[PDB]
Amino acid sequence: ENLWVTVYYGVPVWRDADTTLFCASDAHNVWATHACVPTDPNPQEIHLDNVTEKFNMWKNNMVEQMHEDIISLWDQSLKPCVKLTPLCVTLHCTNVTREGLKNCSFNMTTELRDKRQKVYSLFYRLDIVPINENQGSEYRLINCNTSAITQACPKVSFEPIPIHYCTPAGFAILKCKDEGFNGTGLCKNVSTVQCTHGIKPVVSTQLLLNGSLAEKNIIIRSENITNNAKIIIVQLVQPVTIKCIRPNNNTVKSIRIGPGQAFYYTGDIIGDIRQAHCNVTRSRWNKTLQEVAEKLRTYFGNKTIIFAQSSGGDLEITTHSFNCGGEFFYCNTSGLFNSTWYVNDTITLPCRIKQIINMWQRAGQAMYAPPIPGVIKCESNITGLLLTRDGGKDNNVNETFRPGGSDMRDNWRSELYKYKVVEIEPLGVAPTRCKRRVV
Amino acid sequence: REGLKNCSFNMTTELRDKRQKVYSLFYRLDIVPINENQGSEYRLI
Amino acid sequence: LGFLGAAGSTMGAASITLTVQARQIKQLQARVLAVEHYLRDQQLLGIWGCSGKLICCTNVPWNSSWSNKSLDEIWNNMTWLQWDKEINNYTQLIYRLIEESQNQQEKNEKELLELD
Amino acid sequence: LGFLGAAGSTMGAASITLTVQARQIKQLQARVLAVEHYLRDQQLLGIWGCSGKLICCTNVPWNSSWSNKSLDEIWNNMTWLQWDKEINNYTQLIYRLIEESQNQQEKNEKELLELD
Amino acid sequence: LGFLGAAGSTMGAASITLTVQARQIKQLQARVLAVEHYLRDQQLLGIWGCSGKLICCTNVPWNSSWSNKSLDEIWNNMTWLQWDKEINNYTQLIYRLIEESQNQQEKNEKELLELD
Ligand SMILES: *[C@@H]1O[C@H](CO)[C@@H](O[C@@H]2O[C@H](CO)[C@@H](O[C@@H]3O[C@H](CO[C@H]4O[C@H](CO[C@H]5O[C@H](CO)[C@@H](O)[C@H](O)[C@@H]5O)[C@@H](O)[C@H](O[C@H]5O[C@H](CO)[C@@H](O)[C@H](O)[C@@H]5O)[C@@H]4O)[C@@H](O)[C@H](O[C@H]4O[C@H](CO)[C@@H](O)[C@H](O)[C@@H]4O[C@H]4O[C@H](CO)[C@@H](O)[C@H](O)[C@@H]4O)[C@@H]3O)[C@H](O)[C@H]2NC(C)=O)[C@H](O)[C@H]1NC(C)=O
Ligand SMILES: *[C@@H]1O[C@H](CO)[C@@H](O[C@@H]2O[C@H](CO)[C@@H](O[C@@H]3O[C@H](CO[C@H]4O[C@H](CO[C@H]5O[C@H](CO)[C@@H](O)[C@H](O)[C@@H]5O)[C@@H](O)[C@H](O[C@H]5O[C@H](CO)[C@@H](O)[C@H](O)[C@@H]5O)[C@@H]4O)[C@@H](O)[C@H](O[C@H]4O[C@H](CO)[C@@H](O)[C@H](O)[C@@H]4O)[C@@H]3O)[C@H](O)[C@H]2NC(C)=O)[C@H](O)[C@H]1NC(C)=O
Ligand SMILES: *[C@@H]1O[C@H](CO)[C@@H](O[C@@H]2O[C@H](CO)[C@@H](O[C@@H]3O[C@H](CO[C@H]4O[C@H](CO)[C@@H](O)[C@H](O)[C@@H]4O)[C@@H](O)[C@H](O[C@H]4O[C@H](CO)[C@@H](O)[C@H](O)[C@@H]4O)[C@@H]3O)[C@H](O)[C@H]2NC(C)=O)[C@H](O)[C@H]1NC(C)=O
Ligand SMILES: *[C@@H]1O[C@H](CO)[C@@H](O[C@@H]2O[C@H](CO)[C@@H](O[C@@H]3O[C@H](CO)[C@@H](O)[C@H](O)[C@@H]3O)[C@H](O)[C@H]2NC(C)=O)[C@H](O)[C@H]1NC(C)=O
Ligand SMILES: *[C@@H]1O[C@H](CO)[C@@H](O[C@@H]2O[C@H](CO)[C@@H](O[C@@H]3O[C@H](CO)[C@@H](O)[C@H](O)[C@@H]3O)[C@H](O)[C@H]2NC(C)=O)[C@H](O)[C@H]1NC(C)=O
Ligand SMILES: *[C@@H]1O[C@H](CO)[C@@H](O[C@@H]2O[C@H](CO)[C@@H](O[C@@H]3O[C@H](CO)[C@@H](O)[C@H](O)[C@@H]3O)[C@H](O)[C@H]2NC(C)=O)[C@H](O)[C@H]1NC(C)=O
Ligand SMILES: *[C@@H]1O[C@H](CO)[C@@H](O[C@@H]2O[C@H](CO)[C@@H](O)[C@H](O)[C@H]2NC(C)=O)[C@H](O)[C@H]1NC(C)=O
Ligand SMILES: *[C@@H]1O[C@H](CO)[C@@H](O[C@@H]2O[C@H](CO)[C@@H](O)[C@H](O)[C@H]2NC(C)=O)[C@H](O)[C@H]1NC(C)=O
Ligand SMILES: *[C@@H]1O[C@H](CO)[C@@H](O[C@@H]2O[C@H](CO)[C@@H](O)[C@H](O)[C@H]2NC(C)=O)[C@H](O)[C@H]1NC(C)=O
Ligand SMILES: *[C@@H]1O[C@H](CO)[C@@H](O)[C@H](O)[C@H]1NC(C)=O
Ligand SMILES: *[C@@H]1O[C@H](CO)[C@@H](O)[C@H](O)[C@H]1NC(C)=O
Ligand SMILES: *[C@@H]1O[C@H](CO)[C@@H](O)[C@H](O)[C@H]1NC(C)=O
Ligand SMILES: *[C@@H]1O[C@H](CO)[C@@H](O)[C@H](O)[C@H]1NC(C)=O
Ligand SMILES: *[C@@H]1O[C@H](CO)[C@@H](O)[C@H](O)[C@H]1NC(C)=O
Ligand SMILES: *[C@@H]1O[C@H](CO)[C@@H](O)[C@H](O)[C@H]1NC(C)=O
Numbered sequence: 001e002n003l004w005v006t007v008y009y010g011v012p013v014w015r016d017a018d019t020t021l022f023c024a025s026d027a028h029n030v031w032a033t034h035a036c037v038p039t040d041p042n043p044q045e046i047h048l049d050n051v052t053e054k055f056n057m058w059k060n061n062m063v064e065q066m067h068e069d070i071i072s073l074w075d076q077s078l079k080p081c082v083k084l085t086p087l088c089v090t091l092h093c094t095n096v097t098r099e100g101l102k103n104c105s106f107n108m109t110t111e112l113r114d115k116r117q118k119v120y121s122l123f124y125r126l127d128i129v130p131i132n133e134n135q136g137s138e139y140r141l142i143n144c145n146t147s148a149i150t151q152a153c154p155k156v157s158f159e160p161i162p163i164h165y166c167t168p169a170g171f172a173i174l175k176c177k178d179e180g181f182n183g184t185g186l187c188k189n190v191s192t193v194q195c196t197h198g199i200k201p202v203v204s205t206q207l208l209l210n211g212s213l214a215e216k217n218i219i220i221r222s223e224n225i226t227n228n229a230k231i232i233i234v235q236l237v238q239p240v241t242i243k244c245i246r247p248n249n250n251t252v253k254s255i256r257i258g259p260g261q262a263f264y265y266t267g268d269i270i271g272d273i274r275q276a277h278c279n280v281t282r283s284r285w286n287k288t289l290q291e292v293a294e295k296l297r298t299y300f301g302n303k304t305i306i307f308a309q310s311s312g313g314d315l316e317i318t319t320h321s322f323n324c325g326g327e328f329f330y331c332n333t334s335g336l337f338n339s340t341w342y343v344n345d346t347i348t349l350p351c352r353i354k355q356i357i358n359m360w361q362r363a364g365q366a367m368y369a370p371p372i373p374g375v376i377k378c379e380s381n382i383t384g385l386l387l388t389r390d391g392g393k394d395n396n397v398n399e400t401f402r403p404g405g406s407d408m409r410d411n412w413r414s415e416l417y418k419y420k421v422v423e424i425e426p427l428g429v430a431p432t433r434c435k436r437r438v439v
Numbered sequence: 440r441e442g443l444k445n446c447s448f449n450m451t452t453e454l455r456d457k458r459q460k461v462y463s464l465f466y467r468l469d470i471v472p473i474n475e476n477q478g479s480e481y482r483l484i
Numbered sequence: 485l486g487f488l489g490a491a492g493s494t495m496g497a498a499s500i501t502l503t504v505q506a507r508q509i510k511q512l513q514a515r516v517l518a519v520e521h522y523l524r525d526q527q528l529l530g531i532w533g534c535s536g537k538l539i540c541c542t543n544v545p546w547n548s549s550w551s552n553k554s555l556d557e558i559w560n561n562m563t564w565l566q567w568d569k570e571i572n573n574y575t576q577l578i579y580r581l582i583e584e585s586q587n588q589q590e591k592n593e594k595e596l597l598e599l600d
Numbered sequence: 601l602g603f604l605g606a607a608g609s610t611m612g613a614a615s616i617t618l619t620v621q622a623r624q625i626k627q628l629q630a631r632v633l634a635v636e637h638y639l640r641d642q643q644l645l646g647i648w649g650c651s652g653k654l655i656c657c658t659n660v661p662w663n664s665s666w667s668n669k670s671l672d673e674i675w676n677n678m679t680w681l682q683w684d685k686e687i688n689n690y691t692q693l694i695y696r697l698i699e700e701s702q703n704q705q706e707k708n709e710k711e712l713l714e715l716d
Numbered sequence: 717l718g719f720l721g722a723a724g725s726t727m728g729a730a731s732i733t734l735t736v737q738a739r740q741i742k743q744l745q746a747r748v749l750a751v752e753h754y755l756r757d758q759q760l761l762g763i764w765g766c767s768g769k770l771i772c773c774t775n776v777p778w779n780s781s782w783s784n785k786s787l788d789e790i791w792n793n794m795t796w797l798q799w800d801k802e803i804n805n806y807t808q809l810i811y812r813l814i815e816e817s818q819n820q821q822e823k824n825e826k827e828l829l830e831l832d
């Protein structure tokens with residue numbers, strides 16, 4: 001038979017593609033969700049019968065776009081806010097009478113250019129570095145030698161709001177529905193959505209908070225489980241509740257820097273001074289560690305599983321950072337990772353609070369969070385872990401893992417692992433017996 | 440040579456309350472004498 | 485079914501759903517891109533004389549080098565996803581041949597009307 | 601008569617004037633939006649097989665549930681504004697039925713041509 | 717031959733190549749502008765009833781005052797660039813007449829649709 005080319009339009013095919021995604025959200029937050037497109041009141045999802053597709057969470061560029069959007073939104077929120085450049089001034093400090101706080105005094109500018117005022121304030125020792133004169137009485141803010149410091153606006157909330165990511169028409173997002181999935185390899189159950197489920201921005205360095213839970217079993221994900229350089233993401237079946245407190249009752253005072261500006265600081269503490277801390281229930285955490293170890297043994301030859309604290313590096317690396325009440329906490333997680341698991345009350349984690357932060361580790365940038373008055377309490381769920389393998393060892397007896405990861409993108413991957421962006425190509429051609437009639 | 444001058448100024452520092460004395464060389468083209476024309480003081484062109 | 489619900493179905497079975505897929509600062513960029521995407525394919529249909537049609541037969545003969553498969557092997561034994569991969573290296577060649585054939589047809593119909 | 605000048609006229613009278621009305625940083629947003637609206641309407645007409653026509657007959661039978669009105673009650677006694685309100689809840693259903701009918705029609709045209 | 721390679725050829729010779737040219741914040745504005753130019757021409761074809769065609773005959777008689785050249789003098793003795801210059805001042809008159817002829821055709825089509 002003589003076959004002829006026939007053109008079809010609306011053909012159900014796609015190819016992998018990278019396209020600009022835009023935010024959507026449920027109908028002043030730092031993420032500017034008011035700018036986002038309202039979500040559909042009844043979101044659609046279409047199961048694709050007989051479709052098997054390859055996913056790779058480590059090559060996923062939705063992650064790169066999310067990271068750029070998170071940084072860009074953060075920066076936009078600081079543009080109208082008060083600069084603290086005038087505060088880089090010699091500080092004179094004494095003990096508050098704990099070691100974590102110093103009572104500092106300094107000369108600061110006023111609404112009038114020719115006038116000056118003396119300001120008394122309390123600072124966390126982490127935000128304070130000694131001046132090279134080394135008299136022990138003179139100090140400066142820690143980032144004055146590396147960056148301008150901008151005060152976050154007190155009106156701007158840092159609370160996470162779920163953000164749905166949507167793709168342009170003519171593009172679609174595939175979702176993996178398999179009961180367990182490594183984020184790599186072939187997914188048997190695939191469905192199509194215009195937008196992702198809402199994903200909360202969460203900033204953390206060792207533990208993943210308030211993320212998605214595994215349906216049945218703990219899922220361990222890595223680009224290469226045998227390569228110690230790679231960061232291992234562990235998703236938990238059940239959450240472990242972590243609760244945090246800042247026992248100090250801070251009294252917040254405000255002093256004008258200049259016209260249109262104000263500086264917020266803790267001027268006094270009511271009651272005794274106590275170290276901030278977070279607790280994890282011991283029995284629930286222990287069950288979690290055992291289950292993680294049981295899963296790790298399936299990749300590592302049933303070697304004894306050892307957990308250990310980070311070997312070193314910056315506070316941002318060695319401790320668990322998070323935003324609680326608008327305050328930035330850094331907690332010592334060695335209480336969580338001290339166990340050894342053979343094949344055969346609560347845990348209290350000390351914490352520190354730092355007002356000057358560099359969340360994206362960018363040179364030349366810094367933010368000063370204003371203090372939040374009164375006692376601060378938070379509650380969140382540990383939903384996953386960031387682990388690294390301690391390599392360089394040939395031991396066949398046991399294996400060692402430590403908390404933490406190389407990048408913030410590792411957090412975004414924990415929610416986006418199941419999503420893939422594809423371009424829809426409605427045209428196609430195929431042979432038929434059909435021939436066009438000509439006038 | 441005549442094309443260069445050795446100039447000094449009080450520059451600001453990392454700390455607002457401190458100042459430092461700085462010595463540097465500038466090309467004559469970038470430097471303008473004070474309007475008093477005494478030749479003892481200069482500014483950027 | 486639903487959007488792309490036919491993607492795993494055979495090429496013949498999938499044809500019943502063509503209309504399902506025929507329909508359908510960063511937000512502004514998304515909107516402009518969606519328009520460019522849509523028009524790219526509509527432009528080809530307009531050139532091919534296939535505008536306004538979901539299925540459009542042409543005068544271009546099938547060249548067996550593109551595929552030696554029988555019609556049953558294509559229509560009752562393949563998904564469109566598999567088919568696109570098989571002829572991915574010939575797709576642009578086919579597109580040009582359709583365009584050449586349409587232009588000759590447009591010319592021939594003009595000449596027919598000139599005679600009549 | 602001019603643009604929308606028929607809006608208060610009956611639907612039958614208005615059908616005569618469709619030819620007239622078929623025609624006709626913030627500026628950038630206005631330009632993009634104007635394009636999206638033009639293409640949105642043309643996309644539906646192309647899928648329906650109605651492209652290039654102001655009046656397009658289909659093979660979809662009228663459901664009395666959509667309206668129980670006689671043709672005279674519709675064409676000589678209503679404005680289009682009133683009519684749209686009456687079928688505002690059925691319009692999307694009607695659109696899908698038109699699309700299915702077009703796809704079945706073209707499939708049948710293909711099968712007919714296979715016999716030539 | 718390539719894009720616009722036909723530009724120096726005679727109008728008759730050039731007519732075989734029409735499909736070659738049918739194809740194809742500053743960046744965003746440029747993308748929108750390119751779309752508007754494409755659609756501008758497509759809207760004119762839709763207005764003229766010529767949409768989907770590379771060559772479209774009309775019912776408008778050639779008006780000899782626009783040019784007194786014979787068909788051989790136009791089609792075989794001129795390029796399209798020369799031709800556009802010769803009638804550059806009459807193109808708006810021609811476009812308006814085509815639209816008027818289409819309006820009459822649409823009125824006649826409407827009567828035919830009701831008759832059968
Ligand atoms: C995902 O991938 C899978 C795998 O590729 C896709 O599945 C495949 O889909 C195709 C198309 O539907 C199927 O082909 C069809 O198979 C049937 C025959 O199968 C029948 O016989 C079974 C016999 O078994 C028992 O029951 C009978 C009852 O009489 C008893 O006598 C026996 O003793 C046994 O007890 C029977 O069980 C089947 O019914 C059940 O299974 C079917 C499966 O499809 C279900 O629908 C039923 O609800 C029920 O669960 C079934 O009766 C053939 O008859 C088909 O040929 C007809 O249809 C074709 C459609 O394209 C058509 O081209 C043919 O010409 C033919 O049509 C003729 O007959 C029609 C009858 O109505 C007439 O209307 C028509 O005019 C014409 O005369 C067809 O070959 C594949 O079998 C199926 N493969 C597998 C492995 O299941 C799946 O579709 C993909 N999914 C998606 C979304 O793409
Ligand atoms: C705004 O709304 C109004 C109200 O709905 C609407 O007016 C109605 O318009 C329809 C037509 O669209 C009219 O229905 C037709 O009437 C025809 C004429 O019959 C009489 O009226 C004639 C004048 O009507 C026109 O002009 C007036 C203003 O003058 C205007 O309001 C009308 O709308 C319309 O434009 C008049 O000339 C005619 O003359 C008779 O009476 C005089 C009295 O002195 C006598 O001397 C004459 O010898 C003669 O006896 C008469 O008064 C009627 O012919 C027509 O039926 C024919 O045409 C239809 C349609 O083709 C055919 O189907 C039918 O078989 C016939 O061939 C029909 O009945 C309706 O009457 C108007 N209603 C009212 C209350 O006036 C406006 O048009 C709307 N405006 C817009 C812009 O939409
Ligand atoms: C750039 O400009 C130059 C000059 O205009 C163009 O060259 C002309 O190209 C056209 C199209 O090919 C030529 O038209 C044809 O010329 C033929 C010449 O005859 C050949 O054979 C005789 C011997 O029999 C030789 O002496 C002669 O040198 C040629 O080798 C004609 O035979 C053709 O007539 C036939 O075709 C035409 C068109 O279909 C019919 O109407 C006739 O009835 C007949 O069937 C035809 O006339 C033209 O002659 C060329 N001119 C010159 C001076 O050579 C270039 O093409 C142009 N380049 C581009 C890209 O446009
Ligand atoms: C982390 O764990 C510590 C220890 O479990 C929790 O502190 C405990 O808090 C309760 C309630 O304030 C204390 O009860 C009080 O005890 C004092 C005497 O110490 C008594 O005078 C009060 O009337 C009251 O009974 C409890 O003592 C205290 N435990 C210790 C050892 O100080 C803390 O709350 C935990 N953090 C989180 C976030 O859960
Ligand atoms: C943390 O410190 C703040 C002060 O910086 C405490 O707020 C003060 O709390 C007292 C009560 O303990 C308030 O006085 C009460 O006010 C209510 C008003 O209805 C009145 O009914 C009571 O009889 C009493 O007068 C005081 O106003 C309040 N100060 C401010 C500025 O609100 C706060 O209680 C401390 N938190 C803890 C947990 O101790
Ligand atoms: C978090 O809390 C744990 C428990 O209080 C802290 O553990 C202590 O960490 C220091 C290093 O920062 C250890 O000192 C080291 O001892 C080894 C020998 O064991 C020596 O080779 C090293 O050069 C260094 O001197 C200290 O032993 C360790 N204490 C215990 C009881 O294990 C940890 O430092 C805290 N993390 C942070 C970031 O503050
Ligand atoms: C996954 O990790 C293993 C272990 O690091 C990698 O295996 C190494 O591959 C290189 C290739 O040159 C060899 O030289 C090493 O000897 C291998 N190491 C071991 C312990 O066998 C493997 O290449 C990694 N896979 C990918 C895709 O990067
Ligand atoms: C890690 O485990 C060691 C024990 O292996 C803990 O050290 C113990 O501390 C408790 C409480 O003071 C003592 O009763 C034990 O006798 C200690 N063990 C040894 C061998 O000295 C250590 O505190 C643990 N680390 C964390 C962060 O919990
Ligand atoms: C994991 O295994 C390694 C290797 O056996 C342990 O390191 C050894 O510790 C024993 C303690 O008696 C020493 O005798 C060996 O000489 C050590 N080996 C090396 C290579 O130094 C390590 O202590 C084990 N970890 C845990 C948590 O038990
Ligand atoms: C305060 O503590 C510091 C050490 O952090 C110490 O050097 C200083 O002498 C103390 N001041 C008094 C008055 O004890
Ligand atoms: C928690 O784990 C430790 C070993 O890491 C064990 O000694 C302790 O008994 C466990 N606690 C409970 C309540 O099981
Ligand atoms: C944390 O876990 C508890 C378990 O009861 C659940 O009620 C709560 O909703 C979880 N929180 C989040 C943010 O998922
Ligand atoms: C720097 O300041 C001193 C006074 O502290 C002044 O005498 C000197 O002239 C200043 N130098 C310049 C270049 O202005
Ligand atoms: C068929 O396709 C092959 C590969 O593109 C090509 O070489 C050959 O010339 C084609 N045959 C025809 C008649 O076009
Ligand atoms: C008319 O509409 C009703 C309600 O949707 C539907 O059940 C019925 O089948 C329709 N009739 C026809 C002829 O489509």
Ligand SMILES: *[C@@H]1O[C@H](CO)[C@@H](O)[C@H](O)[C@H]1NC(C)=O
Binds near residue numbers: 779780781782809
């Ligand atoms: C032809 O064009 C001329 C110039 O516009 C005009 O005057 C003349 O009326 C036209 N002829 C016809 C028949 O339209």
Ligand SMILES: *[C@@H]1O[C@H](CO)[C@@H](O)[C@H](O)[C@H]1NC(C)=O
Binds near residue numbers: 789793794
């Ligand atoms: C063809 O047109 C050209 C350019 O106007 C002219 O020079 C030439 O003489 C014309 N030929 C005839 C036969 O009129």
